[PDB]
From a paper:
ICV, however, has only one major surface glycoprotein, the hemagglutinin-esterase-fusion (HEF) protein, which possesses all-in-one of receptor binding, receptor destroying and membrane fusion activities. To further evaluate the infectivity and transmissibility of IDV, we expressed and purified the ectodomain of D/OK HEF, and determined that it also uses 9-O-Acetyl-Sia as its receptor by glycan microarray. We also solved the crystal structure of D/OK HEF, both in its native state (resolution of 2.4 Å) and in complex with its receptor analogue (resolution of 3.1 Å), and the structure of the enzymatically inactive HEF (resolution of 2.4 Å) alone and in complex with two receptor analogs respectively (both resolutions of 2.2 Å).
To avoid the enzymatic cleavage of the receptor substrates, we generated the catalytic mutant for the binding experiments and for the structures of the relevant complexes. Thus, we designed the enzymatically inactive HEF protein (HEF-mut) containing S57A, D356A and H359A substitutions, and expressed it using the same method as wild type protein. The glycan rings of 9-O-Ac-3'SleC go through the open channel between the 230-helix and 270-loop.
Author numbering:
A (entry chain A), D (entry chain A), F (entry chain A): 3 to 193, 197 to 429
B (entry chain B), C (entry chain B), E (entry chain B): 9 to 157
The structure:
């Protein structure tokens, strides 16, 4: 008698091919899968990142931790002071808090800005501070993108030529003036007969500041905006001008009406505009209309040793106050910037404006020891190489790829029977 | 027809591993049973399936570093990278399937070998998973000893 | 020497699959035929060769997306990319060759198994593709029944 | 008796190695091969491309389809009008057809330009229109490279300061003038005694035009070229100048002889030069010599949402007319531009200059539903990953790689024998 | 237990290939020797190990062209490229190990086959690397002829 | 009796897994390894590289080969002359050797510079020649990075407007002057009463020079530096200026004190500064203070057909002379530049300053027929794809990757036993 083990399959079995042997099975299981994506901020390296912020990340606030959007351990990684903002420290308006932001970190989190919003009501002849705000943070984010560190430079070496010029003040600016730019004026120019002499100045952007190397500086090269040569001649003789030159003499900024058309709004009166520019370290010249001279007195110092795309966190008030979205728009138009945004209003635990449940959820990733990828879609762990939907850029780290679930191969499971040769 | 072949069956009828016997009266007429105590095969399948985790973990742990500053998705590039990774996963799959196949087939050979040495040398191998038994000095309790059904 | 070995021959002399027989008078002197009706092998080879198309189509369908705005060929980079793809094709080749080898060898085992059950158990296996037959109750029409040459 | 299947090989058999088993065979067959390359234009995505053209792709021409270099279905994808060209619409010379080119497509085909060649004989004080043509299309192709869409902007908002200045005309320009730039002149300046005042103007490049977003504008900032200050003083007092400034006052174009040497050709008389520049949206200033003011009045609007390398098709007349190769040279020096060129003369089916057999062969790819790669060498289907010779850049899509035929591995075929173990 | 199985031993005790024998008096009690003249196995292992050089040389000869003008190491990118190459080397390794395994196992089968035809058909195969011998017309010089220990 | 081959393993055996069969073994051997890295200079393609040098690579030197840091075959690949340097040929100071460096090679080796170090004691009103040296080689290396070839252009077409101006000389410059720039002066300007007219000039950067295509030119746009407008008025009326304009009139260099502050060092007297700039071919204008005009008269011509990162070799004297490290610092701050530096002093075999054992070791790679990768860490052969430590950039060729030795997989060796199935 011939006795045999017999191998047989059903219509329920499908054949899976192999390099060196096939397999019949009824069930299959996918070989791998998608990695969850979590919205909000995080870091891939806990020992090389830095945060810059305000009360909402300030562990020294009287109401900590209720006033905080991050736990203690994350707050220790921030450089923050209640009431502060990068922009407030750039200009230093009268009576505002003036924090010296500085630090180093390849990954960077910017979570401030709200402390100079329209709610602040800072005037000082500002044409449109929201516009200035957007321009300013754009330059910061651009420079931060390629820098390892950042520091406020709280005082530039400056020198003016006039010996009669005195420090300028205005009732629109709390009856004084910004820390930067400085405002120098000669009391005598008077378009009667007295017309004074063209004013001159230099300012130096240092090659370093403390322990921080400077390869690049963000500065504002402000100019006044008058209604028209005539309204201007209410104050100065001839045409208004305030020109900025590098050491060789190339014009780099300012407003020279003598070639450029006037662009002021009717009967608004005098306005000041402060575009920000990225300049190399060095000494720079200024030439201006005799009566009024503006001189940059601060900067932010960056290096070019490199960094990762940055994270910028929405910085807005609760509903009752007047906010802006200038840092959002700064971030959107600047390459290498990732923006973190709430979907619900800011409702603080401490008071109205500090300690928000959603923001705490969004910032909790800052947070983790196992984040491998950070993107404009959120952050991921190192589970699999795939995600269900694209991780939107900017992004960095070990970042997953989108593939259709159907393109993920399967493996036989359940009852299994081998097959090889042609069996015929 | 004995471990070198897989046969198909229609309608209902269980798939899997069965005992099959042949001639007798001249000429006989076949017979195929309804399962044995192939407990080894079940456990072996379990072990072999769990052993695939090693190859999958190797693949899952490999994620390319990237850095993009750009604000708009480079979709065609993203898709190409995925397609390449899916291709690699496809090779690994084909390797794993053959690895299961070959190691199961070998586990089946080791089952059949234990049966050969169990009635040895009453058994007499006729290729893997098949035996010729002399019905004259192996009765029925003999056959049930050797094959256990 | 029976399906575990491949031998070489010189000058003319056909390569391939043949029937070979041994002793007889004590001591015998060998003999190797001139083909059988190994029709299965021919058809199997055909099927196995056609089955390689699946692995080749997988490879041919994979072409990386690219975008170059540059006006002069980046030759070194182009060559490196090609070299990498040729390397991958080389692995796939080695996989395909072994896959053919293993599945042909198995088809050969399945041929030999049919011969064993054809004269069973007159045949008696001596490793794959070899048998011991008792020339006393298998004459010549018996042997020609079992092996067909 | 021992009876065995015996396996044997000849000197004609070669051994092919495998991972898990070798194979003897007499024949081999290559595993894969090269994909044919077809010369001419094509697209990888039929639902995201656009063509810009002239009579040769205009389905409304009286002689269609005999006057066409493409079939109906492709012509429907073009924005074309008989007698038109991008350059003609840029300047709008008297009596020429003035088509408003506009559309969107990641892949772009430029097949026009011939309608303003030397054959046209447009004068209008042109120094060298062929030079202008080359400069103009260079800017177009550069901007088109990174844009999804393009549109003519057929009228810029402009404003001049003079109240006495009137519209300028010349017998060299059909006794009128271009649509762009505008020519403004004061009849009184007369170097007797009358010398007038410096002229001023502004022109605005919009942030959008219809449904089209503008991130960039191609414009011409023209200036006149006089023989020498003296020949100039035939017309104006002092030195000629026509300067272009952005909103802040930075010089961006024009000709200021007061610092720059004169560069006119002897006794040729006055010439006009019109270099094209790529400018951001905004408002721009002009200052010029009192008698003659030039003001840009048109532009081409592009976005920066991205696009593929473009295809530019040779746009020349049949042998009897006077052609140029300015769009060829524009394309060659501009990154991301692919040029399509005939090897035989243009011989039209409709008339001499429309409906060419070779061009129809070259444009037929526009055409196909199965093109996966487009390159400066031609286009390919998705047959294999290899080509016999390099696909020259620019190129995009699933593009084949060059490899030597000898580096393509083979597979055993014909009679085959397996081998494993050492067999010894 | 005969070429389909590998057994473990404790403390001292040599690992490797040995001759093992079974019953005798009813019931017997086993015995495992202390090496044979398995000279084939030693030489085969040598050949198989040297044959791996082909696959390694293929890998070693493949180095991607690169060009970097940058002054500071892009470390994360460098590490990712290495990690990818190490992954490929890992697949090749797994291929090579199985290739050795399968070709050694086959060389072992070819050894056992020579032993079968050496005492044929006194030997009688009981799965690969095992035989049933009738102690009645194979004495001891017979067994030592066939198995050589 | 049952007789069996029995397979058994020890605690000394470890199991190695395979796709299709496992292997027991006692020993393992690593599958591959690291490729040695050799410090110094080399090339990946012997038929496409060029060297530029001095006596130390000059096969025509009287003391060759004792005065050489390379063997004959490598010296034949250099363009060198004893006593020469790129910088010396740029300016052509009185009595210095003036070699016309020119050649083509995708790989480039710069091994000269030492012949104009502080040891040379060239004065010629130089503010800081070491500074000039660093600026000059920076421009060279930058341009060389993307060029296939380089040539000195030993004479620019120049034209000055003044008919009274004469060639300038000074006792600080061997009682003559540089070849470049040219110095033109009018004897009459005298701030008594005589004040002369603004000087003018043009210089042309050619589109080619001999067989060499020029896409880019390195030139110096020099200007004088006076102590203060007053010390300046020792010489000229009004403010000093020397301005450089392109053909359209855009300022591109010079020193215009009229807007820029003075930057001279007290009582040092007049100094000359010569920053180098990369300019396109064309004709350029100069406007200057009446008394003194400087005009560029030489350049280095480069193309933009592409090249590899360059190698710059430390070019310093033996200890007894006064050296500088300007070419080192030029190379470090310039992308695509690889610097080769000795660790011991230069001790020459011929004399003190030519034929150094260490430099010969470092340059011997130039040298080899089997270098596949060149990097800031040294060069490698094509042994394996790995190195023990990173190859620092810049780098090019088939360059090895760093991996930990532990991540290199092993293969079983020694006594080996196969395993398959579950064996249970
Ligand atoms: C009060 C005065 O002198 N002039 C009126 C002036 O018109 C008077 C007509 N005389 N004439 N001819 O017209 C302007 C607009 O019509 C008025 O602003 C001006 O009155 C201003 O009153 C405001 C309060 O609303 C201020 O007091 C301003 O005076 C200051 C100031 O802004 O506080 C006094 C500051 O000390 C002075 N400081 C400096 C450094 O200049 C400041 C400043 O000059 C002006 O604002 C100039 O503004 C700029 C930046 O151009 O004015 C009175 O001008
Ligand atoms: C006719 C005239 O007024 N002047 C002669 C002028 O020399 C005469 C000497 N008098 N003085 N002293 O010299 C120039 C060159 O020697 C001649 O071109 C000019 O005669 C021109 O005749 C041509 C025909 O060949 C034209 O008629 C031109 O007159 C126009 C024109 O070009 O059509 C008349 C236009 O109305 C006028 N339009 C405007 C808006 O200015 C146009 C134009 O001024 C001039 O071409 C200026 O050209 C530019 C752009 O600078 O001239 C007569 O000039
Ligand atoms: C000698 C002379 O004319 N002037 C003194 C001049 O002060 C004299 C006061 N008179 N007043 N009024 O002051 C300067 C600094 O106090 C002295 O340099 C100058 O004396 C110089 O003597 C030096 C030697 O130390 C030179 O001879 C220099 O004369 C030359 C020169 O440098 O060789 C003569 C050259 O021919 C002349 N060449 C040209 C083309 O100008 C050269 C040159 O002008 C000046 O150096 C100007 O330098 C520049 C580039 O601005 O001077 C005497 O000046
Ligand atoms: C083909 O064979 C398989 C198993 O031989 C059958 O699978 C069983 O089906 C029932 C209900 O579907 C399950 O409860 C059992 O668990 C399955 N078997 C196993 C191995 O677990 C299958 O139903 C058969 N198909 C047909 C068409 O009859
Ligand atoms: C080695 O063997 C093969 C086949 O055994 C021989 O191949 C045959 O050769 C003739 C003419 O070359 C062909 O017409 C046949 O079709 C081939 N056989 C097959 C399998 O199709 C080959 O000629 C032999 N070589 C030598 C050296 O004798
Ligand atoms: C798998 O191992 C086998 C056996 O070691 C290799 O077969 C050898 O291949 C070369 C050709 O490269 C022949 O010259 C040798 O004679 C073969 N040896 C034997 C014993 O047949 C085979 O190359 C390996 N597979 C791969 C793809 O590397
Ligand atoms: C396990 O078995 C192996 C070999 O069967 C033993 O290896 C031998 O050990 C000695 C000294 O260590 C060497 O001189 C021999 O060369 C080794 N054998 C071989 C194959 O060359 C090993 O010692 C055993 N281990 C234990 C724990 O006893
Ligand atoms: C192929 O499958 C076999 C069997 O499932 C795997 O062998 C196992 O390997 C691990 C080591 O990774 C051992 O610890 C297990 O005991 C092995 N199981 C058996 C039954 O031997 C093998 O890993 C797989 N091959 C690869 C390369 O993944
Ligand atoms: C062993 O490998 C090398 C290749 O590294 C080969 O050249 C040599 O001939 C091989 N030895 C044998 C006996 O095959």
């Amino acid at each position: 008698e011939l006795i045999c083990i017999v191998q047989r399959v059903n219509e329920s079995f499908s054949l899976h091919s192999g390099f060196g042997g096939n397999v019949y099975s009824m069930k299959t299981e996918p070989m791998t899968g998608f990695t969850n994506v979590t919205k909000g901020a995080s870091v891939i390296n806990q020992k090389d990142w830095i945060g810059f912020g305000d009360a909402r990340t300030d562990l020294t606030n009287d109401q900590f931790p209720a006033s905080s959007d991050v736990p203690l351990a994350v707050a220790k990684k921030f450089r923050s002071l209640s009431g502060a903002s990068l922009m407030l420290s750039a200009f230093g308006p009268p009576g505002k808090v003036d924090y010296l932001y500085q630090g180093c970190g390849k990954e960077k989190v910017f979570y401030e800005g709200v402390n100079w919003s329209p709610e602040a009501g800072i005037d000082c002849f500002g044409s449109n501070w929201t516009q200035t705000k957007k321009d300013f943070y754009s330059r910061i984010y651009e420079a931060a993108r390629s820098s390892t560190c950042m520091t406020l430079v709280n005082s530039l070496d400056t020198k003016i030529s006039s010996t009669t010029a005195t420090a300028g003040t205005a009732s629109s600016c709390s009856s004084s003036w910004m820390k930067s730019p400085l405002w120098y004026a000669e009391s005598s120019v008077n378009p009667p007969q007295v017309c004074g002499t063209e004013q001159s100045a230099t300012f130096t952007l240092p090659t370093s500041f403390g322990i921080y190397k400077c390869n690049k500086h963000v500065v504002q090269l402000c100019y006044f905006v008058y209604e028209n040569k005539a309204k201007f001649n209410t104050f100065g003789c001839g045409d208004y001008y305030q020109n900025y030159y590098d050491g060789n003499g190339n014009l780099i900024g300012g407003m020279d009406n003598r070639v450029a058309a006037y662009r002021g709004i009717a009967n608004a009166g005098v306005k000041i505009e402060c575009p920000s520019k990225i300049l190399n370290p060095g000494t720079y010249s200024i030439k201006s209309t005799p009566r009024f001279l503006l001189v940059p007195k601060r900067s932010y110092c960056f290096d070019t040793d490199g960094g990762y795309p940055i994270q910028v966190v929405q910085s807005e008030w609760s509903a009752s106050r007047r906010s802006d979205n200038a840092t959002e728009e700064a971030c959107l138009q600047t390459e290498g910037c990732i923006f973190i945004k709430k979907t619900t209003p800011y409702v603080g635990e401490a008071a109205d404006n500090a300690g928000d449940i959603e923001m705490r959820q969004l910032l909790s990733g800052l947070g983790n020891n196992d984040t491998v990828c950070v993107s404009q879609s959120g952050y991921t762990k190192g589970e699999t190489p795939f995600v269900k939907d694209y991780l939107s850029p900017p992004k960095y780290g070990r970042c997953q790829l989108k593939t259709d679930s159907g393109r993920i191969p399967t493996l036989p499971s359940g009852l299994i029977i081998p097959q090889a040769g042609t069996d015929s | 027809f004995g471990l070198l072949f897989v046969g198909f069956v229609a309608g209902g009828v269980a798939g899997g591993y069965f005992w099959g016997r042949s001639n007798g009266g001249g000429g006989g007429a076949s017979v195929s049973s309804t399962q044995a105590g192939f407990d080894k095969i079940g456990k072996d399948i379990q072990q072999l399936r769990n052993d695939t985790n090693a190859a999958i973990e190797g693949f899952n742990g490999r994620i390319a570093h990237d850095e993009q500053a750009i604000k708009n998705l480079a979709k065609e590039i993203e898709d190409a990278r995925a397609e390449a990774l899916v291709g690699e996963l496809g090779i690994i799959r084909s390797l794993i399937v053959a690895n299961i196949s070959m190691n199961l087939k070998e586990s089946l050979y080791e089952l059949a070998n234990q049966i050969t040495k169990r009635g040895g040398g009453i058994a007499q191998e006729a290729g893997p998973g098949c035996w010729y038994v002399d019905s004259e000095n192996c009765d029925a309790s003999c056959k049930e000893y050797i094959f256990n059904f």
